[PDB]
Design an enzyme around this catalytic site. Structure first.
Site, PDB file in Angstrom:
ATOM      1  N   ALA A  35       0.829  -1.318  -0.028  1.00 45.94           N
ATOM      2  CA  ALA A  35      -0.003  -0.090   0.070  1.00 45.94           C
ATOM      3  C   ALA A  35       0.871   1.344  -0.164  1.00 45.94           C
ATOM      4  O   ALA A  35       0.378   2.384  -0.035  1.00 45.94           O
ATOM      5  CB  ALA A  35      -0.897  -0.049   1.080  1.00 45.94           C
ATOM      6  N   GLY A  36       2.011   0.954  -0.045  1.00 46.73           N
ATOM      7  CA  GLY A  36       3.148   2.342  -0.050  1.00 46.73           C
ATOM      8  C   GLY A  36       3.616   2.725   1.345  1.00 46.73           C
ATOM      9  O   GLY A  36       4.453   3.752   1.282  1.00 46.73           O
ATOM     10  N   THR A  48       7.624   3.008   0.654  1.00 45.90           N
ATOM     11  CA  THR A  48       7.928   3.973  -0.319  1.00 45.90           C
ATOM     12  C   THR A  48       7.938   5.306   0.476  1.00 45.90           C
ATOM     13  O   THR A  48       8.856   6.125   0.644  1.00 45.90           O
ATOM     14  CB  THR A  48       6.934   4.222  -1.489  1.00 45.90           C
ATOM     15  N   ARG A  91      14.909 -10.107  -2.100  1.00 44.75           N
ATOM     16  CA  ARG A  91      14.464  -9.611  -3.398  1.00 44.75           C
ATOM     17  C   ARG A  91      15.775  -8.994  -3.935  1.00 44.75           C
ATOM     18  O   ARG A  91      16.563  -8.664  -3.450  1.00 44.75           O
ATOM     19  CB  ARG A  91      13.423  -8.462  -3.304  1.00 44.75           C
ATOM     20  N   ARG A 143       2.221  -2.815 -11.610  1.00 44.88           N
ATOM     21  CA  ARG A 143       3.821  -2.987 -11.188  1.00 44.88           C
ATOM     22  C   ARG A 143       4.344  -4.314 -11.731  1.00 44.88           C
ATOM     23  O   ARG A 143       5.232  -4.284 -12.553  1.00 44.88           O
ATOM     24  CB  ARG A 143       3.983  -2.957  -9.589  1.00 44.88           C
ATOM     25  N   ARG A 183      -0.434 -11.972  -0.921  1.00 39.50           N
ATOM     26  CA  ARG A 183      -0.331 -10.420  -0.439  1.00 39.50           C
ATOM     27  C   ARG A 183      -1.868  -9.754  -0.321  1.00 39.50           C
ATOM     28  O   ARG A 183      -2.132  -9.159   0.523  1.00 39.50           O
ATOM     29  CB  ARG A 183       0.432  -9.567  -1.347  1.00 39.50           C
ATOM     30  N   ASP A 235      -4.019   8.003  -1.340  1.00 43.96           N
ATOM     31  CA  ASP A 235      -4.569   8.342  -2.867  1.00 43.96           C
ATOM     32  C   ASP A 235      -3.692   8.567  -3.705  1.00 43.96           C
ATOM     33  O   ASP A 235      -3.785   8.080  -4.841  1.00 43.96           O
ATOM     34  CB  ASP A 235      -5.339   9.503  -2.472  1.00 43.96           C
TER      35      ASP A 235
HETATM   36  N1  LIG Z   1       4.887  -8.658  12.594  1.00 38.20           N
HETATM   37  C1  LIG Z   1       6.081  -8.296  11.645  1.00 38.20           C
HETATM   38  N2  LIG Z   1       5.661  -8.208  10.434  1.00 38.20           N
HETATM   39  C2  LIG Z   1       6.625  -7.833   9.305  1.00 38.20           C
HETATM   40  C3  LIG Z   1       8.095  -7.727   9.997  1.00 38.20           C
HETATM   41  N3  LIG Z   1       8.645  -7.346   8.874  1.00 38.20           N
HETATM   42  C4  LIG Z   1       7.971  -7.019   8.084  1.00 38.20           C
HETATM   43  N4  LIG Z   1       6.704  -7.363   8.054  1.00 38.20           N
HETATM   44  C5  LIG Z   1       5.570  -7.585   7.575  1.00 38.20           C
HETATM   45  O1  LIG Z   1       5.326  -8.653   6.699  1.00 38.20           O
HETATM   46  C6  LIG Z   1       4.709  -8.407   5.443  1.00 38.20           C
HETATM   47  C7  LIG Z   1       5.707  -8.906   4.340  1.00 38.20           C
HETATM   48  O2  LIG Z   1       6.330  -8.184   4.048  1.00 38.20           O
HETATM   49  P1  LIG Z   1       7.590  -8.323   2.536  1.00 38.20           P
HETATM   50  O3  LIG Z   1       7.758  -9.752   2.674  1.00 38.20           O
HETATM   51  O4  LIG Z   1       6.405  -7.715   1.695  1.00 38.20           O
HETATM   52  O5  LIG Z   1       8.944  -7.418   2.966  1.00 38.20           O
HETATM   53  C8  LIG Z   1       4.404  -6.763   5.399  1.00 38.20           C
HETATM   54  O6  LIG Z   1       3.170  -6.411   5.813  1.00 38.20           O
HETATM   55  C9  LIG Z   1       5.447  -6.278   6.427  1.00 38.20           C
HETATM   56  O7  LIG Z   1       4.925  -5.007   6.746  1.00 38.20           O
HETATM   57  C10 LIG Z   1       8.240  -7.871  11.433  1.00 38.20           C
HETATM   58  O8  LIG Z   1       9.339  -7.739  11.889  1.00 38.20           O
HETATM   59  N5  LIG Z   1       6.988  -8.181  12.033  1.00 38.20           N
END
Ligand SMILES: Nc1nc2c(ncn2[C@@H]2O[C@H](COP(=O)(O)O)[C@@H](O)[C@H]2O)c(=O)[nH]1
Ligand SMILES: Nc1nc2c(ncn2[C@@H]2O[C@H](COP(=O)(O)O)[C@@H](O)[C@H]2O)c(=O)[nH]1
EC number: 2.7.4.8
Lengths: 190, 196
Positions: free
Chosen positions: A12-13, A16, A41, A134, A145, A169
């Protein structure tokens, strides 16, 4: 400095805006480097975006009590280690956290006492439109997701859960609301 | 019991190559070693990155951190404070990596009184003159700082002979020679870390 917890649906941003907040305010903010067992990544940096560890290393750190909180997302483990928050606190910087809803819940029971900010998309379909346009991951990762986004959005209606709710927005509009919510604390650290 | 993999402490004069030696060890053996990011109150140089080379903080912040018990050790060097925080070492241990530290002579003596129990390696230049040339050729130092570093460097070389202080002394004539000596001295260390 009072910590800042940025939450909301993944994509959701919030990341960013987080990166713009730290780049615009030099010396003020520090990013909490979570651990995760998911694959890094392209472009992500170990020790900067995450501590990328194996599941075995993650479970050992959990068993040692390394984590303020930990959670599961898309079959992978994530967690905020004590060291990651203490590292920012030892810099006298505002620690910024990027976690999911479950992380918010567990952080509520800790001594961090942050300000909780949710970054919401305008709607579930606009979020998917932005992420599909994207086109940066497979349909499986995208849908996983998006399924998590449905639960994250419904809970932002809980009174007292989030101090500030930002609807993205546009990124410039959402960032202006982020800076306003942190204005007094930025001025304090400045 | 035979010791497992221990932390690695590198000391010696800045400008004698211990940092560039450590960066090569870190980039070529990142599956084994992780870097302890020290705090310092000296200003960042060009190319240095906060949270990677140092945690760049003010004296007021560092002293409050010290009073809070954040540090394994700390020392004063050429007008500025340097210190190894607990979280710096624990962050590497939470990565399942062996911690490598870069400290001055005071830090070596400081760490001897802790429970770290590392291997101590001293990286020496060919001479004080070659060191003075390398230091002034790298610039980024006032004359007052360069002089204080030269005086601290003579104490470095003298301490490299103190019996039982260091485990290994490496004379960095060339980086390739010094690196091969560093890997040889860490051969048992690398084997133990890889077998765990
Ligand atoms: N509870 C928790 N969620 C996390 C942590 N690090 C990332 N997230 C959440 O895990 C989700 C996946 O993160 P991504 O894999 O897209 O970086 C996102 O909602 C992100 O905010 C963390 O240390 N603890
Ligand atoms: N005792 C101690 N010395 C350090 C620490 N970090 C860097 N130093 C040492 O302080 C000296 C000055 O570092 P420089 O200013 O050249 O980066 C060098 O000998 C360096 O190894 C530390 O955390 N503790």
């Amino acid at each position: 400095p009072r910590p800042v917890v940025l939450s909301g649906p993944s994509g959701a941003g919030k990341s960013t805006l987080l990166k713009r907040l730290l780049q615009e305010h030099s010396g003020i903010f520090g990013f909490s480097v979570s651990h995760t067992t998911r694959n890094p990544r392209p472009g992500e940096e170990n020790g900067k975006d995450y501590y990328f560890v194996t599941r075995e290393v993650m479970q050992r750190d959990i068993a040692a009590g390394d984590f303020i909180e930990h959670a599961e997302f898309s079959g992978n483990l994530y967690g905020t280690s004590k060291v990651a928050v203490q590292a920012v606190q030892a810099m006298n910087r505002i620690c910024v956290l990027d976690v999911d809803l479950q992380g918010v819940r567990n952080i509520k029971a800790t001594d961090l006492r942050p300000i909780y900010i949710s970054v919401q998309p305008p709607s579930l379909h606009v979020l998917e439109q932005r992420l599909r346009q994207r086109n940066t991951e497979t349909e499986e990762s995208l849908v996983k997701r998006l399924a998590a986004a449905q639960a994250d959005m419904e809970s932002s209606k809980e009174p007292g859960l989030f101090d500030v709710v930002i609807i993205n927005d546009s990124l410039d509009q959402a960032y202006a609301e982020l800076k306003e919510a942190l204005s007094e604390e930025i001025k304090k650290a400045q």
